[PDB]
Amino acid sequence: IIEPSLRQLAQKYNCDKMICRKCYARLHPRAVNCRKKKCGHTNNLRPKKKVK
Amino acid sequence: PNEIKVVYLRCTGGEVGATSALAPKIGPLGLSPKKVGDDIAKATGDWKGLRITVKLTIQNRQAQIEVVPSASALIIKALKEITFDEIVNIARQMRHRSLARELSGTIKEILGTAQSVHPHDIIDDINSGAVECP
Amino acid sequence: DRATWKSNYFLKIIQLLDDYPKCFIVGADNVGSKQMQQIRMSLRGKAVVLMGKNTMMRKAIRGHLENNPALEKLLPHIRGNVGFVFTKEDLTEIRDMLLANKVPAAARAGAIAPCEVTVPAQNTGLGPEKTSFFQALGITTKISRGTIEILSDVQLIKTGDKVGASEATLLNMLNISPFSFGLVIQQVFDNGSIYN
Amino acid sequence: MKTILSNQTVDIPENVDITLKGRTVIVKGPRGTLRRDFNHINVELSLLGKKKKRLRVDKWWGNRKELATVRTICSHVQNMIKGVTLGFRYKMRSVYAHFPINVVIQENGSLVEIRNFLGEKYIRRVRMRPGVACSVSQAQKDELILEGNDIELVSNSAALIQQATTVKNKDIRKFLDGIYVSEKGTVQQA
RNA sequence: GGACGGUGGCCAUGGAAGUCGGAAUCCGCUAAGGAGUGUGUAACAACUCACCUGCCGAAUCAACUAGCCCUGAAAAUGGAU
Ligand SMILES: [Mg+2]
Ligand SMILES: [Zn+2]
Structure with missing residues (x-):
């Protein structure tokens, strides 16, 4: 019964994020290169999949 | 509120449809027309035009009056069984003709390319019926 | 085409200021195309108003102003969202008409209110189901004839404040006139003179 | 390339003074x-x-790595000036699906108790940083207000609360529970 | 802030309205309109995008290229510039 305005805030910290394809890190949605060393700061980033 | 609001547009035509049309799918919106309200609109809305017929209606509680916005890409198929500058001269003046326009030749320069579905050479250098509209 | 756009814009504005040496400047608010088309429909019979890049108008009058002298005072007088409106008539002709046909475009979330508007005590006239706006804002409205009714002199908005969410959403449905604004005139320039 | 000088000047309001030692x-x-x-x-x-x-603040003969520190200090000073005159107020909203989050404020607002997160009997005891005051607001149904001088400490304290309420071995996209920071406001609204 | 009429464009039809697709791309208005870059809706709708304007007053952006470094880079007794 979560009303949408609070629902959007929760999804900000849980769904609105980019994912590195090589090391599965969690990145801010506006990122361009992964911040993690072990993936070599690659650029292959995909949006985090939704629940739909 | 004029006792009613039926401003929403209807897009049925050609075959009568009735039961198989979209009107039963839109019926629970207002609860006033039901089977006896859309059919009397269909009785006058069967023609003008015999196409998808994006049209508007005004309700008189029990009765209705229907006016069809003369869509340019609809009336071309409605008149389809070339310039045809004569048929665009008459049927488009009764259109509300807002178009965010300022000049007179807006209608001819608009529909002359809306009929492309090329009639653009007539658009570029047009000289017959320059002051035809007023 | 951008360079030709710049050259064309100088040409039209310089054949319009030379046409109208009596030149007025006006500061437009964050207004939509309807109100630009409103002044266009209300003035195109004898004049025209245009919008463009602010630096462009200064460059059109920086070295190319020399066609007619005594116009040089316009450089330090054009700042902010202001332009040039050209007309042939006297000082009082355009000021009263342009400041009278102000479109009440309602209050957006985050609008300034220099004008004081106070809600009176009257019957609102809408349904008895949206009392949550009045109860949360501090106004006690009692149901009379199934209608919301303001029963007391209550403040609505101060001077020099910012409209809130609950302050604006009730303002839209209440059908009460809010603060108005529009194409407010800055000043004039009557061939080498500046007046209020 | 080594830039000769990359200075950046901040402005101090007259109501606050700054003394520099080294x-x-x-x-x-x-x-x-x-x-x-x-x-x-x-x-x-x-x-x-x-x-x-x-x-x-001045930097002489720096490379691209260390000119970034020049404004990094400047932002820090602006944060210090902001804190000592306005203070940092953080609003956290507790969101839940079936198990309502129960929050109890301990002494002086320096300790927070979370009781029924996701309906588990474990009691979470998160200790705030010194100088940071937390409280349950009267403004809304579910709001925690964190007021303190340093944005460093306050935001760190708030993030500790948020990271504590973390769902485990579940679909975090569906399970939206947890206390999350809503806005980063100020105090006295000056 | 605007994202205009044909335009719910044609043909696919059981919806494909700008966004599933086979193809053509136009103007009166303007600083704005792309019959639509995307999400999304059975479809609507809802935005946003490209397009400029208002403050903002000095350098910025893109594609490359090769030096160092990083990732790519996992084996068994504890050890090798
Ligand atoms: Mg599982
Ligand atoms: Zn990575």
Whole structure:
């Protein structure tokens, strides 16, 4: 019964994020290169999949 | 509120449809027309035009009056069984003709390319019926 | 085409200021195309108003102003969202008409209110189901004839404040006139003179 | 390439004064006192304003890596000035699906108890940083207010609360429970 | 802030309205309109996008290229510039 305005805030910290394809890190949605060393700061980033 | 609001547009035509049309799918919106309200609109809305017929209606509680916005890409198929500058001269003046326009030749320069579905050479250098509209 | 756009814009504005040496400047608010088309429909019979890049108008009058002298005072007088409106008539002709046909475009979330508007005590006239706006804002409205009714002199908005969410959403449905604004005139320039 | 000088000057309001000892900044304002040193960054600190208190930081012969620290310090000083005159107020909203989150504030607002997160009997005891005051607001149904002088401590304290309420071995996209920061406001709204 | 009429464009039809697709791309208005870059809706709708304007007053952006470094880079007794 979560009303949408609070629902959007929760999804900000849980769904609105980019994912590195090589090391599965969690990145801010506006990122361009992964911040993690072990993936070599690659650029292959995909949006985090939704629940739909 | 004029006792009613039926401003929403209807897009049925050609075959009568009735039961198989979209009107039963839109019926629970207002609860006033039901089977006896859309059919009397269909009785006058069967023609003008015999196409998808994006049209508007005004309700008189029990009765209705229907006016069809003369869509340019609809009336071309409605008149389809070339310039045809004569048929665009008459049927488009009764259109509300807002178009965010300022000049007179807006209608001819608009529909002359809306009929492309090329009639653009007539658009570029047009000289017959320059002051035809007023 | 951008360079030709710049050259064309100088040409039209310089054949319009030379046409109208009596030149007025006006500061437009964050207004939509309807109100630009409103002044266009209300003035195109004898004049025209245009919008463009602010630096462009200064460059059109920086070295190319020399066609007619005594116009040089316009450089330090054009700042902010202001332009040039050209007309042939006297000082009082355009000021009263342009400041009278102000479109009440309602209050957006985050609008300034220099004008004081106070809600009176009257019957609102809408349904008895949206009392949550009045109860949360501090106004006690009692149901009379199934209608919301303001029963007391209550403040609505101060001077020099910012409209809130609950302050604006009730303002839209209440059908009460809010603060108005529009194409407010800055000043004039009557061939080498500046007046209020 | 080594840039000769990359300076950046901040402005100090007259109601607050700054005294510099080496690379240690002492900020003394109406809402309290803030000290933070910058010995780890090789910069030159100068006070320009005997009249309006302009503070200037300088870096001589730096590479692209270390010119970034110049404004990093400047933002830190602006945060210090902001804290000692306005203070940082963080609003956290507790969101839940079936198990309502119960929050109890302990002594002086320095300790927070979370009782029924996701309906588990474990009791979470998160301790705030010193100088950070937390409280349950009266403004809304579910709001926690964190007020303190340093944005460093306050945001760290708030993030500790948020990270504590973390769902485990579940689909975090569907299970939306947890206390999340809503906005980063100020106090006294000046 | 605007994202205009044909335009719910044609043909696919059981919806494909700008966004599933086979193809053509136009103007009166303007600083704005792309019959639509995307999400999304059975479809609507809802935005946003490209397009400029208002403050904002000095350099910025893109594609490359090769030096160092990083990732790519996992084996068994504890050890090798
Ligand atoms: Mg599982
Ligand atoms: Zn990575």
